[PDB]
PDB file of C-alpha atoms in Angstrom:
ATOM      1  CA  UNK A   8     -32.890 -37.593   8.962  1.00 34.61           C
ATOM      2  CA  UNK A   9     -31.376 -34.100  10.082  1.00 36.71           C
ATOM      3  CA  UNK A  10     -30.445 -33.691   6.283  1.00 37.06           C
ATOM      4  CA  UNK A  11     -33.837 -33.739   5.335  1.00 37.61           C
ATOM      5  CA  UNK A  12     -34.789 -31.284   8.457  1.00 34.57           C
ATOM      6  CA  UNK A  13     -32.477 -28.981   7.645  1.00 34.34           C
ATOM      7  CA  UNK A  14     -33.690 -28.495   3.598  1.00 34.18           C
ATOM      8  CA  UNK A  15     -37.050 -28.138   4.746  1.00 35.59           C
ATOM      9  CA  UNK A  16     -36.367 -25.595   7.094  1.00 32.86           C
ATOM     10  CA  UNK A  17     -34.382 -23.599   4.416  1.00 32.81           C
ATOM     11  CA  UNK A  18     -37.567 -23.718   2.153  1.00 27.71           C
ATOM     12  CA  UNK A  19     -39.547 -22.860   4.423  1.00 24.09           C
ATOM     13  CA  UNK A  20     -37.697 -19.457   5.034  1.00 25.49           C
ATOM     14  CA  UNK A  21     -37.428 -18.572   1.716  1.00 27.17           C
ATOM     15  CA  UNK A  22     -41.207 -19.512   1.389  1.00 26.92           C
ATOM     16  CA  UNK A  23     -41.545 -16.556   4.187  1.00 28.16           C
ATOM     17  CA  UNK A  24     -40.179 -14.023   1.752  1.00 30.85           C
ATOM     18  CA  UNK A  25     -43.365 -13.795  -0.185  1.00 31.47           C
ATOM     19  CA  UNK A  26     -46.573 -11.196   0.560  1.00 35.74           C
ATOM     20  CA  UNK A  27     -50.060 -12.827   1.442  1.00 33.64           C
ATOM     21  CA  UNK A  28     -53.123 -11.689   0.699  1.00 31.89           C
ATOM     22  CA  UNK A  29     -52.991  -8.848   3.120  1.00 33.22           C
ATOM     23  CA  UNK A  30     -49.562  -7.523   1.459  1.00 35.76           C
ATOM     24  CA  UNK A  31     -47.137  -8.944   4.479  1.00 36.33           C
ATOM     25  CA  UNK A  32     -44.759 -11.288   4.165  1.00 36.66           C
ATOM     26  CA  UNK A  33     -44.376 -14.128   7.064  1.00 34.50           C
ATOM     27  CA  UNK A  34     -42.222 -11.909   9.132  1.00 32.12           C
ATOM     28  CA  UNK A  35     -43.879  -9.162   9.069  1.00 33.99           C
ATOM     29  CA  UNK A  36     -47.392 -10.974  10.137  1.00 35.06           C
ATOM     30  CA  UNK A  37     -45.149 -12.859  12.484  1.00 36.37           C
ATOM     31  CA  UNK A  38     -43.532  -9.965  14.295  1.00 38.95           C
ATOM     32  CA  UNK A  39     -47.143  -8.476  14.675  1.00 39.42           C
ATOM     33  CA  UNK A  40     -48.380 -11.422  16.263  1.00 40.01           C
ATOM     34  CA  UNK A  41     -45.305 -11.775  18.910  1.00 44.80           C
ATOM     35  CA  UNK A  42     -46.020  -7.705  20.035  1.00 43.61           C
ATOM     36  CA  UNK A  43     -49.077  -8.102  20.374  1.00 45.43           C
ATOM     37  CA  UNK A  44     -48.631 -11.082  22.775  1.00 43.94           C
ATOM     38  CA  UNK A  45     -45.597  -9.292  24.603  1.00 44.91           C
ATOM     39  CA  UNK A  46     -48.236  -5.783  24.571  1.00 43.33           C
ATOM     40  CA  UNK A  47     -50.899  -8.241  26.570  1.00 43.07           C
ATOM     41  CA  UNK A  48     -48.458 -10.223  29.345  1.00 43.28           C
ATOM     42  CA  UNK A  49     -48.193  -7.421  31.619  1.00 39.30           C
ATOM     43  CA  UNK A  50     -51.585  -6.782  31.233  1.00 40.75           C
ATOM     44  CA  UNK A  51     -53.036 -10.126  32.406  1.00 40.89           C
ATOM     45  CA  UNK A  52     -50.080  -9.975  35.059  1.00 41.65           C
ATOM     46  CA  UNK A  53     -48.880 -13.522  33.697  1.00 42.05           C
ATOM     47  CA  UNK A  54     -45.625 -12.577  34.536  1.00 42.49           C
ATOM     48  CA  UNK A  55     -45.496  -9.839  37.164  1.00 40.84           C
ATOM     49  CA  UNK A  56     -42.468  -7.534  37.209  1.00 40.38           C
ATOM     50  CA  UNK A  57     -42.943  -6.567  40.924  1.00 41.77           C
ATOM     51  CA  UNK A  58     -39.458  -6.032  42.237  1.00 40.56           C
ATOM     52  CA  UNK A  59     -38.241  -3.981  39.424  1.00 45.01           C
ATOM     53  CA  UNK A  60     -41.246  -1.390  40.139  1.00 44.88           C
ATOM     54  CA  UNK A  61     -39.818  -1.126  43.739  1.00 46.25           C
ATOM     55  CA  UNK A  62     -39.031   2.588  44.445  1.00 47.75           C
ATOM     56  CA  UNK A  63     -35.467   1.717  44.986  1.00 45.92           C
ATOM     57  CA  UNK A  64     -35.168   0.293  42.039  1.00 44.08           C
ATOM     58  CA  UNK A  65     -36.467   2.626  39.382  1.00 40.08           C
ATOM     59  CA  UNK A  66     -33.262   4.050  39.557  1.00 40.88           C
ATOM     60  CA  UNK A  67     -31.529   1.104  38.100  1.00 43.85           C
ATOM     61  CA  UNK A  68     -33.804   0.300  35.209  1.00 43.51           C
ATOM     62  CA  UNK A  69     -32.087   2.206  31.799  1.00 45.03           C
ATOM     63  CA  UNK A  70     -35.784   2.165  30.329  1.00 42.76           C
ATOM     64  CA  UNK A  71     -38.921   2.356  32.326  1.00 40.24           C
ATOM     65  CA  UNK A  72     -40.516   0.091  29.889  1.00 38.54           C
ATOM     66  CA  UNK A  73     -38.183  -2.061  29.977  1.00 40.11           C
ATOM     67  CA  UNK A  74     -38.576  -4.711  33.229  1.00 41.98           C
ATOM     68  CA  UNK A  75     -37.028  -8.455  34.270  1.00 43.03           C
ATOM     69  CA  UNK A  76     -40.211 -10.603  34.871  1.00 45.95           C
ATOM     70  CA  UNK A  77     -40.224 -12.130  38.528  1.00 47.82           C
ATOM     71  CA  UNK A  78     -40.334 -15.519  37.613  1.00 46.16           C
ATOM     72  CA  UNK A  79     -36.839 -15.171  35.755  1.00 46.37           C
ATOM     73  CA  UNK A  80     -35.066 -12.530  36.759  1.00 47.28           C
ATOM     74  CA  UNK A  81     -31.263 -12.710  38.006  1.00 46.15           C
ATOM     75  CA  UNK A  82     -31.038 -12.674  41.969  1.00 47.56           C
ATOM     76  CA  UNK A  83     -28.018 -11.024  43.566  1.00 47.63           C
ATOM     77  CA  UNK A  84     -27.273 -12.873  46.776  1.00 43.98           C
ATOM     78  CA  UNK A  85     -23.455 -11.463  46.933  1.00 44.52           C
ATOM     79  CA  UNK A  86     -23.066  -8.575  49.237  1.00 43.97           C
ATOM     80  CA  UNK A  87     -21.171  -5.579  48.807  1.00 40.45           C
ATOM     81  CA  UNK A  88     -20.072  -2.480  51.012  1.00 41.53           C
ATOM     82  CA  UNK A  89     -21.858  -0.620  48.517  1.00 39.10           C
ATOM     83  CA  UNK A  90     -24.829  -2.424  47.364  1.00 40.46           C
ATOM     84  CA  UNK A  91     -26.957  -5.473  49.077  1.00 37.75           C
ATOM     85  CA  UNK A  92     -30.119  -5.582  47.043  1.00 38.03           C
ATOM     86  CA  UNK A  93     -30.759  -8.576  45.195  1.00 35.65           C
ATOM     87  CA  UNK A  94     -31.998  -6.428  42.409  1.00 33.21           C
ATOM     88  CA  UNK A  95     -30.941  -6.656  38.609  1.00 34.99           C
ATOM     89  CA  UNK A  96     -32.276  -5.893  35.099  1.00 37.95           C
ATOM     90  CA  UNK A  97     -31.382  -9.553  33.863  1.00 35.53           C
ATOM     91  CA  UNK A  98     -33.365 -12.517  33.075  1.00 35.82           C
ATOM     92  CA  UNK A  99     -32.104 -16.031  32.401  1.00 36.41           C
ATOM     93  CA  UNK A 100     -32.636 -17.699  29.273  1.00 38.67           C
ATOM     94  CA  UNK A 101     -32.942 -21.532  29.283  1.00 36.58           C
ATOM     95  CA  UNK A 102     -30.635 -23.328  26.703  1.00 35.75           C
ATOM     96  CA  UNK A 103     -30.870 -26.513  25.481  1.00 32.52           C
ATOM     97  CA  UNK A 104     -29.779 -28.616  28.537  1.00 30.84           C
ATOM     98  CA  UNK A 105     -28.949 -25.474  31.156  1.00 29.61           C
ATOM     99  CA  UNK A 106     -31.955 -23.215  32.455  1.00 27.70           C
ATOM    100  CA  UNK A 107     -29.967 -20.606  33.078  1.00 25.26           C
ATOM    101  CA  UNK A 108     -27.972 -21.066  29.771  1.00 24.81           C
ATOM    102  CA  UNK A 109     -28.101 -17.078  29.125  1.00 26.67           C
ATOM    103  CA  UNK A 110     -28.239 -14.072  31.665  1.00 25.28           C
ATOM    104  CA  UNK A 111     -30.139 -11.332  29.479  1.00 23.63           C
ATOM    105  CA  UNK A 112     -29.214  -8.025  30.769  1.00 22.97           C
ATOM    106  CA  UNK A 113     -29.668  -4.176  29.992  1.00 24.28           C
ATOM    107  CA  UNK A 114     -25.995  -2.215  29.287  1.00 27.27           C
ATOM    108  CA  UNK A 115     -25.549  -1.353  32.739  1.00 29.75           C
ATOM    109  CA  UNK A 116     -25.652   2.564  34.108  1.00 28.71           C
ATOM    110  CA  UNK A 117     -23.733   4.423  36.264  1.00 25.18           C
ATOM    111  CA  UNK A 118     -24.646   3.020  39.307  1.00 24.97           C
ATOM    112  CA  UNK A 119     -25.719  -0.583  38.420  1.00 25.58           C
ATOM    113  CA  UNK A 120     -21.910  -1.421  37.018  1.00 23.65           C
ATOM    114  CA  UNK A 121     -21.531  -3.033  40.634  1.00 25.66           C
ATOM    115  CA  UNK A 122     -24.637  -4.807  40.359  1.00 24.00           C
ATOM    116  CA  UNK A 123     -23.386  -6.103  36.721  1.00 21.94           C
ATOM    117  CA  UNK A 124     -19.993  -7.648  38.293  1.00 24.44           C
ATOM    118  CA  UNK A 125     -22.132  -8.580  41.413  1.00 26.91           C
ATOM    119  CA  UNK A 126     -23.896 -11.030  39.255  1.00 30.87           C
ATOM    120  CA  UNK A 127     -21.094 -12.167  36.574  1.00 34.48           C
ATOM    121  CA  UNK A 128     -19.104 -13.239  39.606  1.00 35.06           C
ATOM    122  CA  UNK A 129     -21.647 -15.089  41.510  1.00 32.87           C
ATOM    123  CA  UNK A 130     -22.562 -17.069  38.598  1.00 33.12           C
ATOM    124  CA  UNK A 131     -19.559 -17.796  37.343  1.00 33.40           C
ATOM    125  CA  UNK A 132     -19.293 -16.158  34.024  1.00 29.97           C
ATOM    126  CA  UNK A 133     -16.989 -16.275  31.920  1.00 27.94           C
ATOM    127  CA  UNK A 134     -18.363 -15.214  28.345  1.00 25.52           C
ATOM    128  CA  UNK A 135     -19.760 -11.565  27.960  1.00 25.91           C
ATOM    129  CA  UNK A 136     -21.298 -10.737  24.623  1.00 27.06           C
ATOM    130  CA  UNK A 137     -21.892  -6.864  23.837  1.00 28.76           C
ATOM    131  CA  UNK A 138     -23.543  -6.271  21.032  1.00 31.07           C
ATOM    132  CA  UNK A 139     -24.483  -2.186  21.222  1.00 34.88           C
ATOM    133  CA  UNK A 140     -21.430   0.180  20.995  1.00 32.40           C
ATOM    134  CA  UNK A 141     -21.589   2.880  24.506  1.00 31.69           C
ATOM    135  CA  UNK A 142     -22.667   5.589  22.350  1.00 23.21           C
ATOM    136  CA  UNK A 143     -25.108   4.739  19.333  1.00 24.97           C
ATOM    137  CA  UNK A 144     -27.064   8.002  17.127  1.00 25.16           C
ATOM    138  CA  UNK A 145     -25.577  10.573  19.984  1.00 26.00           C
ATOM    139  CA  UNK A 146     -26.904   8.494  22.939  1.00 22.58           C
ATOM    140  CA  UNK A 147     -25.425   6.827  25.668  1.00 21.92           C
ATOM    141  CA  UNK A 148     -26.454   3.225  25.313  1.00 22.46           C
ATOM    142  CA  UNK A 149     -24.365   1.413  27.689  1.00 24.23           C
ATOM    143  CA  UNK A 150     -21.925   2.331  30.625  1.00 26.17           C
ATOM    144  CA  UNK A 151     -17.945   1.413  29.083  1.00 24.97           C
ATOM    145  CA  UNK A 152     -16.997  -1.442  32.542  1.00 27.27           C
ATOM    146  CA  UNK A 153     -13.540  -2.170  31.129  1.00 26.38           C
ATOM    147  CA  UNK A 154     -10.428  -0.450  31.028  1.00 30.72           C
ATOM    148  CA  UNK A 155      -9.480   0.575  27.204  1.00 28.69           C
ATOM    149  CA  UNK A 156      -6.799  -1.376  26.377  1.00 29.00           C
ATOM    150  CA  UNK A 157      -3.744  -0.210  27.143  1.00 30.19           C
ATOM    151  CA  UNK A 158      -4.771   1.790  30.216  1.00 29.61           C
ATOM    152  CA  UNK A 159      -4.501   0.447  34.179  1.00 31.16           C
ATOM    153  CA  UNK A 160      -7.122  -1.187  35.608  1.00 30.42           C
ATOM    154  CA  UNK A 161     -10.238   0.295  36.615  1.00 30.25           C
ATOM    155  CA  UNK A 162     -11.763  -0.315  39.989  1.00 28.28           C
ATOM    156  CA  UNK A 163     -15.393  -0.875  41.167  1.00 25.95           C
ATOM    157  CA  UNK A 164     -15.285  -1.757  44.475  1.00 27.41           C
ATOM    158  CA  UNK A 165     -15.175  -4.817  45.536  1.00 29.43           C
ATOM    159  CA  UNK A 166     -14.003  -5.902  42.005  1.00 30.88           C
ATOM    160  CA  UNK A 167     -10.983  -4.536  40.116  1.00 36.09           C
ATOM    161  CA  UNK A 168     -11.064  -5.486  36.648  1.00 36.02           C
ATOM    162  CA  UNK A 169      -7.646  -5.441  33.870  1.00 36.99           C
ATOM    163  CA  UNK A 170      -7.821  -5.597  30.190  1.00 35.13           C
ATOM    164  CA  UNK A 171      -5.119  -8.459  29.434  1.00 38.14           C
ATOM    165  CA  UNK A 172      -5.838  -8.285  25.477  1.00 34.37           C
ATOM    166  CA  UNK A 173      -7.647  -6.941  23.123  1.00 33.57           C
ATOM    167  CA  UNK A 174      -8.113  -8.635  19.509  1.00 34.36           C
ATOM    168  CA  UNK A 175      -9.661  -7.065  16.429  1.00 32.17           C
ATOM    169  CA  UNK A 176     -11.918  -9.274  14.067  1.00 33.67           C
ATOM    170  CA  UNK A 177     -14.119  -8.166  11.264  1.00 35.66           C
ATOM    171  CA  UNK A 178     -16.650  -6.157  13.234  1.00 34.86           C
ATOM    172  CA  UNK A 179     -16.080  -7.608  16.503  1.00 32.18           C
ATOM    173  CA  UNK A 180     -13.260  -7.071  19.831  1.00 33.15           C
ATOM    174  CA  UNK A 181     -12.576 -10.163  21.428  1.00 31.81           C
ATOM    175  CA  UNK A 182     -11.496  -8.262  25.141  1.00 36.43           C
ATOM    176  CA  UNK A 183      -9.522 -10.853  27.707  1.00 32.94           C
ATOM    177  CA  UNK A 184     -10.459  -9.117  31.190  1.00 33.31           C
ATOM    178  CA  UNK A 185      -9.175 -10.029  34.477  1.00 32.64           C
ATOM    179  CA  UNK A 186     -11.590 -10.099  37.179  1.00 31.73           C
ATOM    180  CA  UNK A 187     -10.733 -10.201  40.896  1.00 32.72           C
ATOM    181  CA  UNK A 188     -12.618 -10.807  44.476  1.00 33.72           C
ATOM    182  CA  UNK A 189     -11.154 -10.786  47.655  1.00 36.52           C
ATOM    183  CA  UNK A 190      -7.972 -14.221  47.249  1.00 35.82           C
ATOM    184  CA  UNK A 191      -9.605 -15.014  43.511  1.00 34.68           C
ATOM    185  CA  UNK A 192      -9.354 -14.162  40.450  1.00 36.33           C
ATOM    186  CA  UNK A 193     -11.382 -14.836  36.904  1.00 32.02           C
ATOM    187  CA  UNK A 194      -9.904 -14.607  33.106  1.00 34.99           C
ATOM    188  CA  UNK A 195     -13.151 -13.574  31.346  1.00 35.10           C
ATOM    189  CA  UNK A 196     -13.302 -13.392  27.768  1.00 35.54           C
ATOM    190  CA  UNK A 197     -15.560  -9.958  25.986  1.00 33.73           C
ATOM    191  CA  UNK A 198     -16.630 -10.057  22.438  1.00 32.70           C
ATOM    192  CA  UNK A 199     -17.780  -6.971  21.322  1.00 33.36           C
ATOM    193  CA  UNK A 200     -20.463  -6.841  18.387  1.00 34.99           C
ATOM    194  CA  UNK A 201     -19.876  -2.698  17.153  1.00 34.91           C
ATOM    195  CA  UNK A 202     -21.370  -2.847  13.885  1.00 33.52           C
ATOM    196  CA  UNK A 203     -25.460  -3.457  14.666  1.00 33.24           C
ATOM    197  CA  UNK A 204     -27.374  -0.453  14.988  1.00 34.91           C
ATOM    198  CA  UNK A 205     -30.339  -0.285  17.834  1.00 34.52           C
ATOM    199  CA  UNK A 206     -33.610  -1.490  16.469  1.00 33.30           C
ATOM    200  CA  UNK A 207     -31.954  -2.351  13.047  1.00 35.14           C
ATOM    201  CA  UNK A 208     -29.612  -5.134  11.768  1.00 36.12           C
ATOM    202  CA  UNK A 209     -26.136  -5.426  10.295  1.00 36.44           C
ATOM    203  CA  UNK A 210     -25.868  -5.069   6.361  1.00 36.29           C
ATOM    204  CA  UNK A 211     -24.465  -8.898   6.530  1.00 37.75           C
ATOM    205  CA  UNK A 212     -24.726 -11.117   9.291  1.00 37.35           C
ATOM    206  CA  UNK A 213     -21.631 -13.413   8.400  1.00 33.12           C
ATOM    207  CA  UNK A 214     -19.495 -12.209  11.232  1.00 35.54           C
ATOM    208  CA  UNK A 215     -22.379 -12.550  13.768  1.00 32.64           C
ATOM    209  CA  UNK A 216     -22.312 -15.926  12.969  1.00 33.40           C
ATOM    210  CA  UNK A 217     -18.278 -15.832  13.401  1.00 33.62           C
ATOM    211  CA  UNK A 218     -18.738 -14.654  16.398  1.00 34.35           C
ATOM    212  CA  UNK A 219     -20.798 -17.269  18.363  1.00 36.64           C
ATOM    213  CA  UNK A 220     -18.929 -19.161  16.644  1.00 40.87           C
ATOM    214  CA  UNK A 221     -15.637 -18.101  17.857  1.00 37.43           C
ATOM    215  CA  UNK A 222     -16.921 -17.541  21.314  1.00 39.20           C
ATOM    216  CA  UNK A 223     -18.302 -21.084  21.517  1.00 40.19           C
ATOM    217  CA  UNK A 224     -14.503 -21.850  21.266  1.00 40.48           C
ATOM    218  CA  UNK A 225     -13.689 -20.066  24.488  1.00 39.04           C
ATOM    219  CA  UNK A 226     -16.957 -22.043  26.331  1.00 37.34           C
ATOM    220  CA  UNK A 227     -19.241 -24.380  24.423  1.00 36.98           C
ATOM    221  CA  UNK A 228     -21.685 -25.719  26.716  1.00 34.58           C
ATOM    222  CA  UNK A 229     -23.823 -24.526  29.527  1.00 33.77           C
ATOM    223  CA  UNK A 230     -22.320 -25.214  32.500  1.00 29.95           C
ATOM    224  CA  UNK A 231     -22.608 -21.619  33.234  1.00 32.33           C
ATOM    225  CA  UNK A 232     -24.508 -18.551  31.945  1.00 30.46           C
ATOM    226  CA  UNK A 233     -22.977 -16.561  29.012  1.00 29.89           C
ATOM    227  CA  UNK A 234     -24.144 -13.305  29.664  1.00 28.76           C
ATOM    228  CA  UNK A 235     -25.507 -11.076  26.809  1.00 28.96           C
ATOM    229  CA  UNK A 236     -26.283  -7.825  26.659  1.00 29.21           C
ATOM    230  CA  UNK A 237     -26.915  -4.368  24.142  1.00 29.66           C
ATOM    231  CA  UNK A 238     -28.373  -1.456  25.937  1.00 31.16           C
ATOM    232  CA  UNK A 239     -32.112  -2.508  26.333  1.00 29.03           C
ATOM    233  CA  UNK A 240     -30.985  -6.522  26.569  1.00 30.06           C
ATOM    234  CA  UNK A 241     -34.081  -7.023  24.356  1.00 29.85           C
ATOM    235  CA  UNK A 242     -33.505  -6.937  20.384  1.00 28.07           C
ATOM    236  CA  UNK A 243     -30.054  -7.993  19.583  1.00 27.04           C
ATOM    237  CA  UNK A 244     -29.532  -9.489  22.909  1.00 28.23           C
ATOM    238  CA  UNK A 245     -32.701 -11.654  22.314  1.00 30.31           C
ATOM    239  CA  UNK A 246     -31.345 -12.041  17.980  1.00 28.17           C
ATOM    240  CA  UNK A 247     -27.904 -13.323  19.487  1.00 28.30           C
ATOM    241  CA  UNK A 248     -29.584 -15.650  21.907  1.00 29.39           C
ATOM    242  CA  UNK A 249     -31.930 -17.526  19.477  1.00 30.92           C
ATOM    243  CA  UNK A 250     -29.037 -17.815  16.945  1.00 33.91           C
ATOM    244  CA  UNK A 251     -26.573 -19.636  19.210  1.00 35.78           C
ATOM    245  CA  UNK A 252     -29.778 -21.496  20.674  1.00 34.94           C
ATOM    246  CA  UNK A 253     -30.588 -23.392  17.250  1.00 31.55           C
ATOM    247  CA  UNK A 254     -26.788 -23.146  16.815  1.00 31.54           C
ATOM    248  CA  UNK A 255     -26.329 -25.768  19.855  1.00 30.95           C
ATOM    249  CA  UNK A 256     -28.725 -27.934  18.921  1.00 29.11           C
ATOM    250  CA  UNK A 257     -27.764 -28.040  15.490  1.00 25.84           C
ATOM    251  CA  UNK A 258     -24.398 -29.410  16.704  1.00 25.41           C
ATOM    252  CA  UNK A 259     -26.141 -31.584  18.790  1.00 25.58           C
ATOM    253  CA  UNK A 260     -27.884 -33.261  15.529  1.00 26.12           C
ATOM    254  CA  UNK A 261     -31.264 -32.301  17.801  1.00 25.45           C
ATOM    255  CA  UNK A 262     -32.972 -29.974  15.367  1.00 26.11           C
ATOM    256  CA  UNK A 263     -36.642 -31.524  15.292  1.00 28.36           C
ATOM    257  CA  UNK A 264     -39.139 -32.059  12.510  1.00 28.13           C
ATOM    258  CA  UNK A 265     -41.288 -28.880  11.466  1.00 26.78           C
ATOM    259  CA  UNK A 266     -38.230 -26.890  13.320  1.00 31.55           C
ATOM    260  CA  UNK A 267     -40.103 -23.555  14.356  1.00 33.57           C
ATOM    261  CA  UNK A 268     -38.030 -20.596  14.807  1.00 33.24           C
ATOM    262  CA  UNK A 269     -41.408 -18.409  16.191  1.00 31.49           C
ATOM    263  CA  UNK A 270     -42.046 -20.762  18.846  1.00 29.94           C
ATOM    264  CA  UNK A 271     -38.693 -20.585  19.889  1.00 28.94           C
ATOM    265  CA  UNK A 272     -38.869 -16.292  20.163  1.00 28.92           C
ATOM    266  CA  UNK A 273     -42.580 -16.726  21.377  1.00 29.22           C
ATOM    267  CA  UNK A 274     -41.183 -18.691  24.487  1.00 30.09           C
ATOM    268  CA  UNK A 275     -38.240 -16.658  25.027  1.00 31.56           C
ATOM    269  CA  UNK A 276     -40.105 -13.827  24.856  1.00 32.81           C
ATOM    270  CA  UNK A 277     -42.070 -15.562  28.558  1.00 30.90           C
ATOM    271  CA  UNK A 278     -38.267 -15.154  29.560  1.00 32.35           C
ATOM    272  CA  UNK A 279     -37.140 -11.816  28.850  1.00 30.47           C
ATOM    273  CA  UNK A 280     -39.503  -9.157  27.749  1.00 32.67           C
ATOM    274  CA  UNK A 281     -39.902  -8.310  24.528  1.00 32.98           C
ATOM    275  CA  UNK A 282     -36.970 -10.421  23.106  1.00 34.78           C
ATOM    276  CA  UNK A 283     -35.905 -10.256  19.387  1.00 40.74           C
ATOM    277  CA  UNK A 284     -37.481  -6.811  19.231  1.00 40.78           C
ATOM    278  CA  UNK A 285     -38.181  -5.812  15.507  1.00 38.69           C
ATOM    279  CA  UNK A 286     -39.704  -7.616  12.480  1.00 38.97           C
ATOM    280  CA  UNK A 287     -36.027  -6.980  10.520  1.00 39.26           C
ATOM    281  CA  UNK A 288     -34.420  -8.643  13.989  1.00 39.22           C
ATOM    282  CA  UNK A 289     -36.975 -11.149  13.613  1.00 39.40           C
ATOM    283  CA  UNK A 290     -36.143 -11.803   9.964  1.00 40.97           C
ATOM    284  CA  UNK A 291     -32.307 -11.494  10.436  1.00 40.94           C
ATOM    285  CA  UNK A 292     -32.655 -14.969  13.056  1.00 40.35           C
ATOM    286  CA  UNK A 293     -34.530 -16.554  10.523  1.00 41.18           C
ATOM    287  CA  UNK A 294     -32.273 -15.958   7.506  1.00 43.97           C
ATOM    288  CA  UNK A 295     -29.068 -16.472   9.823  1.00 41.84           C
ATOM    289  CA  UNK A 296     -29.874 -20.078  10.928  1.00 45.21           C
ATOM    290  CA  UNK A 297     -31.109 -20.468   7.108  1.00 40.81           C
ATOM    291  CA  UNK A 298     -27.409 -19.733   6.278  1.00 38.85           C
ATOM    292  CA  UNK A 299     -26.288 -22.266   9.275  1.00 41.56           C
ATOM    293  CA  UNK A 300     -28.225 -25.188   7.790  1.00 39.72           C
ATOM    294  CA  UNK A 301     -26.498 -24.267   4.127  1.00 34.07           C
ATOM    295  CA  UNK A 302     -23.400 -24.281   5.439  1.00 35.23           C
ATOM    296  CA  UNK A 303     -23.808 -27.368   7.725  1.00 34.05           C
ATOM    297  CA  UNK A 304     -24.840 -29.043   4.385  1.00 33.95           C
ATOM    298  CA  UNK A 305     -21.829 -28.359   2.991  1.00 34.28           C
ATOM    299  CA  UNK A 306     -19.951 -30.764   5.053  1.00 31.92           C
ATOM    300  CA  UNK A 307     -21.497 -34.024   3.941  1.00 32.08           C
TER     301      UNK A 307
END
């Protein structure tokens, strides 16, 4: 029985709370143990990272440490006047039915902004989650690719994109964009997570959860990527992902027996590098699908 799946796994959470012999608590010992994994894959070139070393690329990589693994990473075949390389920091994350359920992505720079609409067009997107704000502690973390709303639209050739609407939810924009190719054109729906800091969490995660939520509305299967991003497309990116993961298959009534939330990060993290990226991001998954299962108790 689900029922009894879903108690078990909220025991078993709250069972993580508590130190072990060596002082750490079950997230803590976790977290260490999925680092050190991610700090050897590179090194045993399980998953090489070839094209995004390429001299021509370096330039569109927002941290050098920071690389899409061959195996997975995002190919642009659409050309451009501008731009023809198939290159992209992105990596798609397999759902539970689609492989390429989630396109991972760094907040694009500059000159990779092309390259971004490059690959939301050719894979049909339709869903963009943005969960970094474009500056963050006096940095810039992410290049702003849509009009503010009220203004005209902004144009990266090929692609002109509008700002339709812009909503306001409790710490969250839900932006309707208009995207447009050649004869076609693309509504595309933005939600825009502002209040979690880089390498931290939110005080609450409620309105994370009212957010996948609320974007599952606009597209809730995976026909087609959603693409996610912060600035790194790591750490929240790889929080958001897991969350609306277990999410789907908690809808699904699929959630298996001895559910196991590290396995799930440990093979992500074979997907995109270095996914969920702290122990507190690492915690925050684990408490938010806790919260899930309470809720989806409620209802029977």
């Amino acid at each position: 029985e689900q029922v009894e799946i879903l108690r078990k796994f909220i025991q078993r959470v709250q069972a993580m709370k508590s130190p072990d012999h060596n002082g750490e608590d079950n997230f803590a010992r976790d977290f260490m143990r999925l680092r050190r994994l991610s700090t050897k894959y590179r090194t045993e070139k399980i998953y090489p990272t070839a094209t995004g070393e390429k001299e021509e690329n370096v330039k569109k990589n927002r941290y050098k440490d920071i690389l899409p693994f061959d195996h997975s990473r995002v190919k642009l075949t659409l050309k451009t006047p501008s731009q023809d390389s198939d290159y992209i920091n992105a990596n798609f994350i397999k759902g539970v039915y689609g492989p390429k359920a989630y396109v991972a992505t760094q907040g694009p720079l500059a000159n990779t902004v092309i390259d971004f609409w490059r690959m939301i067009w050719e894979y049909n997107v339709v869903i963009i989650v943005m969960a970094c704000r474009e500056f963050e502690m006096g940095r810039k973390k992410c290049e702003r690719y849509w009009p503010l709303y009220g203004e005209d639209p902004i144009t990266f050739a090929p692609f002109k994109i509008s700002c339709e609407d812009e909503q306001a939810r409790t710490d969250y924009f839900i932006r309707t964009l208009l995207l447009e190719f050649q004869n076609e054109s693309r509504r595309l729906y933005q939600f825009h997570y502002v209040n979690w800091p880089d390498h931290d969490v939110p005080s609450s995660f409620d309105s994370i959860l009212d957010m996948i939520s609320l974007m599952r509305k606009y597209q809730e299967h995976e026909d087609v990527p959603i693409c996610i991003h912060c600035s790194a497309g790591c750490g929240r990116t790889g929080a958001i992902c897991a969350i609306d993961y277990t999410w789907n298959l908690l809808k699904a009534g699929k959630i298996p027996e001895e559910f196991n939330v590290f396995n799930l990060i440990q093979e992500m993290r074979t997907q995109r590098h270095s996914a969920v990226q702290t122990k507190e991001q690492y915690e925050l998954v684990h408490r938010a699908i806790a919260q899930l299962f309470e809720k989806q108790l409620q209802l029977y």
